[PDB]
A paper describes a structure:
Human anti-apoptotic proteins Bcl-2, Bcl-xL, Bcl-w, Mcl-1 and Bfl-1 have a globular, helical fold and function by binding to short, α-helical Bcl-2 homology 3 (BH3) motifs in pro-apoptotic proteins, as shown in Figure 1A. The role of anti-apoptotic protein Bfl-1 in cancer is less characterized than that of Mcl-1 or Bcl-xL, but many lines of evidence suggest that Bfl-1 is also a critical target. Thus, Bfl-1 is an intriguing therapeutic target and biomarker for resistance to cytotoxic anticancer drugs.
Crystals of the Mcl-1/FS2 peptide complex were grown at room temperature in hanging drops over a reservoir containing 0.2 M zinc sulfate, 0.1 M imidazole (pH 6.5), and 3% 6-aminohexanoic acid. The protein was mixed with peptide at a 1:1 molar ratio and diluted to 2 mg/ml in 20 mM Tris, 150 mM NaCl, 1% glycerol, 1 mM DTT, pH 8.0. For example, the structures of FS2 bound to Bfl-1 can be used to design chemical crosslinks to reinforce helicity and promote cellular uptake, the structure of FS2 bound to Mcl-1 can be used to further reduce Mcl-1 binding, and the structure of FS2_1fX can be used as a platform for the design of therapeutic peptides and small molecules that covalently target Bfl-1.
Numbering used by the authors:
A (entry chain C): 1 to 23
B (entry chain A): 170 to 325
The structure:
Amino acid sequence: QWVREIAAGLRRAADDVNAQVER
Amino acid sequence: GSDELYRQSLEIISRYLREQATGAKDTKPMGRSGATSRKALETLRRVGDGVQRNHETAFQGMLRKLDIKNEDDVKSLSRVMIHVFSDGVTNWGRIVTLISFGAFVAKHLKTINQESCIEPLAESITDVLVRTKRDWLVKQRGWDGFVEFFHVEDLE
Ligand SMILES: [Zn+2]
Ligand SMILES: [Zn+2]
Ligand SMILES: [Zn+2]
Ligand SMILES: [Zn+2]
């Protein structure tokens, strides 16, 4: 399903952003 | 009248999307709660631009799936944003990522048609963000919390 696949990638990117902040 | 959070949100998001799609700054400094809005936009420029740089190829893949399966990108993007938050997790990292991808979509729309306006995309993003996370945004002090979360306090 296309919606899930896109959301999954954005979640991975967002998690990357959060890891950067508290480093 | 009413709803200062929605207005403020839309102004910050509209200008960022408008800059990114056209490549020009609005000038037109401030209005209403300018200081917070001015720092939020600069924070959005720094983080937003970085997210798009660092995940450019991933965004291209999402963009392709977005175009092929359904007709309207703004309607389709809304589906994505809701699903992103469907697990019940909310944080600034996710919010800024969704705005960053919206800016990516805005560029794409200006390429396929140079006359396309960004307002429908921006107001749709602002609609999801403000309506569905109203009280959460309020608890984080709105855009003051957004600014501080992404503000590096010591360079050393
Ligand atoms: Zn899901
Ligand atoms: Zn990243
Ligand atoms: Zn498209
Ligand atoms: Zn600070």
